[PDB]
């Protein structure tokens, strides 16, 4: 990985030294001394604050004030904070709209934002500051292009809040060494989270102390570690995408069959919703998510070796604290657990061959077979499902042009399913697309999306589909020979955009399968 500069050793300011101590940067110490810098403070280390404050999500509006406090700390550390901050979205808001086309998007924005100022500032480390929405692996991809010492501060969910994309990625980042103990289960506005974000500057001097770098940290054992987390708390199929984009940021490979191979390895035990009935603030109650690694470490699920940014292994971060509290029943035993293996469930077959994600209970069966549906957005199958409902009855829906490339933006559905739902069709059609979905079979993440001309996008209406959970296939009855035919006519759609930062995103952006990163 070479992105990010390089510094000019035991000093504490192995960056802000190329612009504090030589006389040919006396321009660069003029204007530090302009933001309120003494002669003294030159020679202190220079740390990024960068929060995800915005006023429309009730996830991110209370965030400056957490900055304020990081900030504190980090002064009070004898160090100097420099506050900034990026944009977010709220999915809450856009989700049904186009709105959501921009939505995974700003996850690679956020990591481009972050690690633009650090680079051209020559900050020393980073504390970061994302709230309860979704795009908080974005500050930890900028940490690994970055290298540098860097803490993530959980913003913290809001309390009345389930296994998420919010709960799921901040739990899997405090299971892989990059926040604080306690900090992806103390609920948002909570006065521990306060004291967390004052606390943060004192663990930092001690990474700036040991050099303790974020690819010191985020390493193939952690990020099994973090893959453990998701599949014991049944976490969201959009941590696959967050965990690869993560391990790509650091050099380091992670592959769908990864996942497949820890959720073989590793049984959902968390009774948390969606799937079950407690939220973040149950587990806040009976230990926090220190417990759950805890628990999880004794049964040998996780790696107590790796490093973490306390300075110490998470063996030693754990050795101490509570266990998850006597007669509690949100996290099963390993005798009795809520599925034999996780949740998350890899796919391929002759529709997939690149690959796909579901999220599978168990109590759904092992196959599907049925006709293909197919529509070539969300609209036009939320309209058909409205004025023929049962022409769904025993069909494969198929909502493909959603994609990476083709959404543009890979959007994230909700309505078919409520949809389906509400016509009674739960279990009595499948479910496909090459985007995201948030009792039946579905599929989202299939890969060629249509857009790149893979399969998907050559079914048409009555193909027979078969999903076998068993085998991990989805297949169809067209022979191989009349797909390959229906490819050598097929033409790729124009793109739905020209400008703007989709279609740059359309340029940049890889497949699902290679967790959507835009940088390679």
């Not at 900055?67 to 700390?73: D, F, I, L, M, R």
């Not at 990625?169 to 006065?191: F, T």
């Not at 690149?354 to 957005?377: H, M, N, W």
């Amino acid at each position: 990985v070479t992105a990010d500069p390089s510094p000019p050793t035991n000093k504490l300011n192995k960056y802000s030294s190329r612009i504090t101590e030589p006389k040919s940067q006396g321009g660069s110490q003029a204007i530090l001394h302009g933001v309120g810098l003494s002669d003294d403070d030159l020679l202190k280390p220079q740390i990024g604050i960068s929060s995800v404050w915005y006023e429309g999500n009730t996830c991110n509006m209370h965030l400056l004030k957490l900055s304020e406090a990081v900030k504190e700390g980090v002064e009070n550390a004898g160090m100097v904070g420099f506050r900034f901050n990026t944009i977010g979205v709220s999915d809450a808001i856009s989700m049904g709209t186009r709105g959501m086309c921009f939505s995974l998007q700003s996850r690679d924005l956020i990591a481009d934002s972050i690690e633009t100022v650090m680079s051209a500032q020559w900050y020393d480390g980073n504390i970061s500051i994302p709230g309860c929405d979704k795009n908080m692996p974005g500050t930890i991809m900028a940490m690994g292009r970055l290298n540098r010492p860097g803490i993530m501060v959980y913003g913290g969910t809001i309390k009345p809040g389930g296994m998420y994309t919010a709960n799921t990625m901040a739990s899997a980042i405090e299971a892989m060494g990059m926040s604080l103990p306690y900090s992806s289960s103390i609920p948002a506005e909570d006065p521990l989270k306060l004291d967390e974000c004052r606390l943060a500057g004192k663990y930092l001097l001690e990474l700036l102390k040991m050099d303790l770098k974020p690819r010191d940290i985020i390493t193939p054992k952690s990020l099994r570690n973090a893959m453990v987390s998701v599949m014991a708390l049944g976490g969201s199929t959009n941590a696959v995408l967050h965990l690869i984009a993560i391990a790509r940021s650091v050099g380091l490979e992670l592959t769908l069959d990864d996942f497949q191979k820890v959720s073989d390895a590793v049984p959902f035990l968390a009774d948390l919703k969606p799937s079950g009935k407690y939220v973040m603030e149950d587990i806040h109650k009976i230990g926090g998510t220190p417990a759950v690694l805890r628990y999880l470490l004794e049964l040998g699920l996780m790696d107590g070796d790796c490093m973490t940014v306390t300075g110490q292994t998470l063996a030693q971060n754990l050795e101490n604290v509570p266990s998850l509290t006597e007669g509690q029943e949100i996290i099963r035993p390993l005798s009795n657990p809520i599925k034999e293996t996780g949740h998350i469930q890899i796919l391929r077959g002759d529709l997939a061959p690149d690959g796909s994600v579901a999220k599978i209970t168990g109590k759904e069966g092992l196959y599907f077979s049925g006709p293909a549906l197919v529509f070539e957005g969300e609209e036009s199958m939320l309209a058909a499902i409205s004025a023929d409902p049962m022409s769904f009855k025993g069909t494969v829906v198929v909502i493909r042009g959603e994609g990476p490339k083709g959404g543009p933006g890979m959007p994230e559905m909700l309505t078919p399913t409520s949809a389906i739902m509400g016509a009674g069709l739960g279990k009595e059609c499948a479910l496909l697309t090459d985007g995201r979905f948030s009792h039946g079979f579905v599929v989202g993440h299939i890969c060629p999306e249509a857009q790149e001309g893979g399969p998907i996008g050559l079914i048409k209406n009555g193909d027979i589909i078969t999903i076998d959970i068993g085998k991990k296939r989805i297949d169809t009855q067209v022979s191989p020979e009349e797909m390959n035919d229906r490819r050598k006519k097929w033409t790729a759609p124009a793109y739905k955009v020209n400008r703007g930062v989709l279609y740059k995103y359309i340029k940049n952006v890889q497949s699902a399968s290679d967790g959507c990163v835009t940088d390679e």
